[PDB]
Amino acid sequence: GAMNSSNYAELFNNDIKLFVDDTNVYRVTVHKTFEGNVATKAINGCIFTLNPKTGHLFLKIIHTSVWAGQKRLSQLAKWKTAEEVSALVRSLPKEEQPKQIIVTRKAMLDPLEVHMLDFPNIAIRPTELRLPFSAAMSIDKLSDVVMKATEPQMVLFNIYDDWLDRISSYTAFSRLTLLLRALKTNEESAKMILLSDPTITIKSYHLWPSFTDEQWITIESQMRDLILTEYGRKYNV
């Protein structure tokens, strides 16, 4: 069934599962033509497939060539996502294949379900959570490798850096979603907060700065404050 606040801890049990987010698969700019009509120009996109227990991220880069000569691209994007997720599952050894795939938007259920017919024992679930995974392209290194790609490419990351050496999955996921929530609500502030102090650097093999434990507490609170402020502004409360 659907994923929500009730069954939220199932994400951190030992059943292998992946989140799939397709929000950044088909990305365009919108511009005016010489005659004054509107046109779109596609840019590179990505599928965000994430194991929330381990932090492993399977960043499937979607090169603009994929769209060439295709109609109804926003519909095609859902099927391409499902196609690439299915290929990812096929490429993994049996004991690594997930038991569940949770799609962050319900439009992906039928495409993925159809692409996964060869895996009848993998459950394709929707979710009621409002996960902020669209802000993945606010992580500088993720956006950089997507924008520079010259061909379809899969790039693997751990989206938790080394946090699990000191905290649980539950807490790691909560930190990630708080950072992404903030990046989504006010990217400029969020990034300011993360980088203000030039003495805290990002390891070449990491995505986020190497904060100490105390510094993560300050950061998380700064991200919390950011998010609540933006709410009052949005709604005049």
Partner: protein, 300 residues
């Protein structure tokens, strides 16, 4: 013109023949239905005045033998049986007419309704969906489940309709996932028409039998099968023109014939709005669209 005599009518029951029906009172001297039009399948059905649950009935074709109804006080229901003694049977039938204890199949000569509802229904195919090969007629009731329903318990009582499933390996060719799911033409024409049904008339026959079971018995799995077979056609971009034209006629007489008060459980909102307004074949059901609109605009 053929006859189906009744040994007696011991319990108060509403009797249907095809789309007609009569109230018969406990121990009323009712002894059968005469003038039944030869050349079509037929269905005789029942609803006890005491259990408005469980409509049941028998599909038959008089060319396949001499059939009669008899109440069974052990099993508690009107049973169809076959009389193998041709002489003994004409004797019972002639005597009952003489005594004029039989109702006349009440066909208006202008009326092709039953023909239109049963055009492609052949007894031989019914007996493959309702497998009970010692009888030439087929029993169906409200409660019977379909093979597909069982999968998701007693297989002897099953409606062995053809399983249609849009999210199956059967429906979907590898590498044509998106194509075959958005355009079911492959599934319709290669897998089902050429593969399983062999021709369109057998397909339409199953579609029609499914509708009549839903209508006469409220069999919910038959309603599901009927909508599935419609949706499969309507969700295919490439359908023989002769099938589209016939489908509009088929659906027209089905919609025309449905009791007005049952549209809610018998008509699936999604499938119809999809077929009539979203599908490839939106523009090909002009008669069925006109009558749906003028009769059940609520559902749409």
């Amino acid at each position: 013109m053929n006859t189906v005599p009744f040994t007696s009518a011991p319990i108060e029951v509403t009797i249907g023949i095809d789309q007609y029906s009569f109230n018969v009172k406990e121990n009323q001297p009712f002894h059968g239905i005469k003038d039944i039009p030869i050349g079509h399948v037929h269905v005789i059905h029942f609803q006890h005045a005491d259990n408005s649950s469980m409509r049941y009935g028998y599909w038959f074709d008089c060319r396949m033998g001499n059939f009669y109804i008899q109440y069974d006080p052990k099993d508690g229901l009107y049973k169809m049986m076959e009389e193998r003694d041709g002489a003994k049977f004409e004797n019972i039938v002639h005597n009952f007419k003489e005594r004029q204890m039989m109702v006349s199949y009440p066909k208006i000569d202008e009326d092709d309704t039953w023909y239109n509802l049963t055009e492609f229904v052949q007894m031989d195919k019914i007996r493959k969906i309702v497998r009970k090969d010692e009888n030439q007629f087929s029993y169906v009731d409200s409660s019977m489940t379909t093979v597909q329903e069982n999968e998701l318990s007693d297989p002897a009582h099953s409606l062995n309709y053809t399983v249609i499933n849009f999210k199956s390996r059967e429906a979907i060719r590898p590498g044509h996932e998106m194509e075959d799911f958005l355009d079911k033409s492959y599934y319709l024409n290669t897998v089902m028409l050429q593969g399983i049904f062999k021709n369109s008339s057998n397909y339409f026959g199953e579609l029609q039998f499914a509708f009549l079971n839903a209508m006469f018995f409220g069999n919910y799995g038959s309603s599901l099968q009927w909508h599935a077979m419609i949706e499969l056609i309507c969700s295919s971009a490439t359908v023989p023109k002769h099938m589209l034209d016939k489908l509009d006629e088929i659906l027209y007489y089905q919609i025309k014939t449905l009791p007005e008060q049952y549209s809610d459980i018998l008509l699936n909102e999604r499938v119809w709005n999809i077929c009539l307004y979203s599908s490839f074949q939106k523009n090909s059901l002009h008669n069925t669209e006109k009558i749906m609109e003028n009769k059940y605009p609520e559902l749409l």
